[PDB]
Amino acid sequence: PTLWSRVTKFGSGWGFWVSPTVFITTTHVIPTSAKEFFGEPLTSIAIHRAGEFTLFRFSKKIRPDLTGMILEEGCPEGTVCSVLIKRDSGELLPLAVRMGAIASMRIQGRLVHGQSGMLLTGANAKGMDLGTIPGDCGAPYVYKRANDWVVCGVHAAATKSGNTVVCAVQA
Amino acid sequence: APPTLWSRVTKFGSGWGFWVSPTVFITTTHVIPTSAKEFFGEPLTSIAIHRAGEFTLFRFSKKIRPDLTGMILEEGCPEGTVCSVLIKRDSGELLPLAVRMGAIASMRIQGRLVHGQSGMLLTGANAKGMDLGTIPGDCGAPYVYKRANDWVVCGVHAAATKSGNTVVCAVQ
Amino acid sequence: PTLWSRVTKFGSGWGFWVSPTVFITTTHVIPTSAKEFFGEPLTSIAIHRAGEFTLFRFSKKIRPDLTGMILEEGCPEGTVCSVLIKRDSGELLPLAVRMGAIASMRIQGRLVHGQSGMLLTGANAKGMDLGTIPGDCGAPYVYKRANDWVVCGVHAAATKSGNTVVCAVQA
Amino acid sequence: APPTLWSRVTKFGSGWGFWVSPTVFITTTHVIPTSAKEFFGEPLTSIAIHRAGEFTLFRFSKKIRPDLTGMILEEGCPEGTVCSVLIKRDSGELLPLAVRMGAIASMRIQGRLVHGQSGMLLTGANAKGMDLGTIPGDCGAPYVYKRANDWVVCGVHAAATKSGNTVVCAVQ
Numbered sequence: 002p003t004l005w006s007r008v009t010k011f012g013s014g015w016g017f018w019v020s021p022t023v024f025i026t027t028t029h030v031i032p033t034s035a036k037e038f039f040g041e042p043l044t045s046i047a048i049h050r051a052g053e054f055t056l057f058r059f060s061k062k063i064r065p066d067l068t069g070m071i072l073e074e075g076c077p078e079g080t081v082c083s084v085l086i087k088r089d090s091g092e093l094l095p096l097a098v099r100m101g102a103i104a105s106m107r108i109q110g111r112l113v114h115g116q117s118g119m120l121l122t123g124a125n126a127k128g129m130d131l132g133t134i135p136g137d138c139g140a141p142y143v144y145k146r147a148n149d150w151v152v153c154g155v156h157a158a159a160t161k162s163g164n165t166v167v168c169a170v171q172a
Numbered sequence: 173a174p175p176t177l178w179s180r181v182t183k184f185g186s187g188w189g190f191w192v193s194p195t196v197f198i199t200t201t202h203v204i205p206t207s208a209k210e211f212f213g214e215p216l217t218s219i220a221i222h223r224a225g226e227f228t229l230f231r232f233s234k235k236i237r238p239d240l241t242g243m244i245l246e247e248g249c250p251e252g253t254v255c256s257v258l259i260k261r262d263s264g265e266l267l268p269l270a271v272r273m274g275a276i277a278s279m280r281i282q283g284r285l286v287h288g289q290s291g292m293l294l295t296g297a298n299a300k301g302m303d304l305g306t307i308p309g310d311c312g313a314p315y316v317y318k319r320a321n322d323w324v325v326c327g328v329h330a331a332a333t334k335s336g337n338t339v340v341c342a343v344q
Numbered sequence: 345p346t347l348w349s350r351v352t353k354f355g356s357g358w359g360f361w362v363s364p365t366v367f368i369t370t371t372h373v374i375p376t377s378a379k380e381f382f383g384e385p386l387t388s389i390a391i392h393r394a395g396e397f398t399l400f401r402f403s404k405k406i407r408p409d410l411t412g413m414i415l416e417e418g419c420p421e422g423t424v425c426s427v428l429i430k431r432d433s434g435e436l437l438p439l440a441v442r443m444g445a446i447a448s449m450r451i452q453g454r455l456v457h458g459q460s461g462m463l464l465t466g467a468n469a470k471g472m473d474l475g476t477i478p479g480d481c482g483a484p485y486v487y488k489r490a491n492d493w494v495v496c497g498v499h500a501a502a503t504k505s506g507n508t509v510v511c512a513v514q515a
Numbered sequence: 516a517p518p519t520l521w522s523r524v525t526k527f528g529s530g531w532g533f534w535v536s537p538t539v540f541i542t543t544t545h546v547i548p549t550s551a552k553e554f555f556g557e558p559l560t561s562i563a564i565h566r567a568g569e570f571t572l573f574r575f576s577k578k579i580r581p582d583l584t585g586m587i588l589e590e591g592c593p594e595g596t597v598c599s600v601l602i603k604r605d606s607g608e609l610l611p612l613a614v615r616m617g618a619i620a621s622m623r624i625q626g627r628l629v630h631g632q633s634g635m636l637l638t639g640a641n642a643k644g645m646d647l648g649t650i651p652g653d654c655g656a657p658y659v660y661k662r663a664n665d666w667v668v669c670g671v672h673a674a675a676t677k678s679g680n681t682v683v684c685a686v687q
């Protein structure tokens with residue numbers, strides 16, 4: 002009965018269960034030495050990568066407690082999403098982000114491609130929480146539309162200021 | 173928010189309260205159990221109650237929480253200050269909901285008349301629900317913000333609109 | 345062909361032409377000594393006041409160049425409106441405001457009733473423009489909905505900070 | 516924005532340009548008339564052109580605008596800075612559109628590849644239109660912001676998305 006339930010610690014960051022068999026994450030957090038994930042051998046896992054966005058489809062239900070949600074290739078410009086950040090502290094941190102255009106976007110010295118957005122906290126977090134930290138990568142971008150939650154990508158990067166974030170998206 | 177702030181948040185009646193010092197506990201008036209004659213081992217006799225509408229402050233005659241340092245409680249915060257509401261949810265999960273504070277207001281929220289410092293949640297578009305917004309069970313949860321050095325507490329969770337987006341913090 | 349066209353200097357502030365015969369303004373800006381407005385005698389003008397919101401209906405078309413727009417009693421909580429500020433300088437200043445609840449709201453020492461909102465400029469204007477000044481009262485609150493512009497009230501007050509505004513609304 | 520800043524905004528080709536000093540005029544590359552051999556009485560011969568994609572700077576050999584003081588032009592602004600875009604519209608109307616600036620970006624805007632400092636308009640929800648947003652005619656309009664004492668200029672209007680909400684400022 003909760004979206005928070007779907008946000009799972011993974012590699013150097015997090016990922017998100019879209020359904021009992023589909024898990025999405027940020028490509029840079031995935032382990033580079035692995036034979037199995039969540040007790041299924043890589044043998045049995047379809048991997049689909051598109052830049053900083055990776056989708057895994059398992060051959061058996063890993064989370065049969067979940068129903069399948071809508072996944073979309075980003076959202077309409079001006080949509081206000083929630084980035085669902087979990088911290089190792091036990092803290093849950095849903096932050097509002099106004100989404101902008103698809104772009105390639107030089108984020109502290111790095112070329113990153115995805116949908117840009119700006120945190121509504123503007124306070125421009127520098128250790129009060131209120132913004133993202135490197136450890137948060139792979140957290141999902143969701144919003145409510147009619148009666149349904151939509152997930153439209155995963156957290157790939159953020160600028161020192163904290164104002165600008167990049168959501169990696171399905172191709 | 174630091175653990176010593178989470179530490180001050182106590183389960184109380186139909187919601188929560190917050191330890192400002194070893195002898196001072198604050199909460200929302202409507203969560204206080206109406207028939208209670210004793211709190212933390214002390215009878216009403218031994219407790220100073222100060223009530224102003226939906227804000228209630230208890231001062232005990234002995235240190236109930238000697239592990240704590242006295243903190244700054246202020247009468248709300250400056251307009252435009254972004255606060256965290258320290259909400260505990262099922263399973264030792266900590267939910268510090270970001271809120272932009274505005275004006276001292278009076279409102280009718282679902283039949284009932286409410287007075288305090290209004291704010292708007294910064295967690296999502298329609299914050300209607302337990303995942304992005306408040307629930308009745310969160311009443312009494314403290315509003316807090318970090319200054320240059322400090323954290324300060326400025327009120328307790330009293331109400332939210334059917335939409336989710338607007339909250340009311342009751343104030344000293 | 346422009347919404348800006350409908351924003352007309354008036355008394356100590358402004359008002360807005362909803363149609364050729366209907367003009368809305370903030371009650372406190374209206375002149376307290378008058379026999380005619382826009383060349384029609386008060387004789388011929390229906391006045392409807394509700395607190396800080398006043399509607400005038402003329403007996404003849406004053407602005408027959410305009411079509412009639414939708415007027416609504418405030419908007420849904422979380423709607424992002426535009427306050428259409430005109431300055432005596434010639435400047436046009438559309439500012440985004442996220443609307444909140446109907447409330448009575450003590451704004452620098454004054455009881456004002458209407459829909460509260462917060463300026464997205466957050467910078468909290470103190471002489472860069474980016475916020476309202478007393479002279480701006482009566483400016484309309486509009487937003488786009490399907491193919492139609494909606495007007496849902498007029499600017500009645502703002503806090504020193506600049507963050508909080510009150511939109512006066514139809515009863 | 517002060518009148519001495521509005522004063523610097525000149526009608527130029529398919530849009531606008533801006534006088535940084537008596538001898539320095541900046542604009543968006545794509546508004547420059549392609550067949551022009553003379554500007555403000557001077558032939559190309561006598562003008563220093565510096566071009567970096569969609570930003571063009573002209574330095575003349577004589578004071579074209581001796582009424583002006585030299586101003587600070589910077590290579591864009593810090594992330595989170597709120598700028599004004601100094602747009603002139605039909606009838607001596609002045610439209611300083613509020614924009615929150617973000618990251619140096621590369622985008623495809625309606626078939627065409629664009630590079631500069633991205634921002635989001637603060638004028639309304641869907642800024643699609645001339646009343647809340649930009650139009651093709653606004654290209655070259657300067658981006659400016661007020662500091663403690665100063666105003667600074669940090670780029671010129673190069674592009675906007677079909678939605679309205681995202682703009683691109685080309686930078687030195």
Ligand SMILES: O=C(O)c1ccccc1OC(F)(F)F
Pocket residue numbers: 182212236237
């Ligand atoms: O001191 C205790 O017994 C205690 C134990 C767990 C949690 C809170 C406590 O403090 C108090 F609220 F005062 F009871």
Ligand SMILES: O=C(O)c1ccccc1OC(F)(F)F
Pocket residue numbers: 525555579580
């Ligand atoms: O100095 C002038 O002739 C002048 C007159 C009106 C507007 C701009 C002007 O400056 C210049 F752009 F340089 F032409």
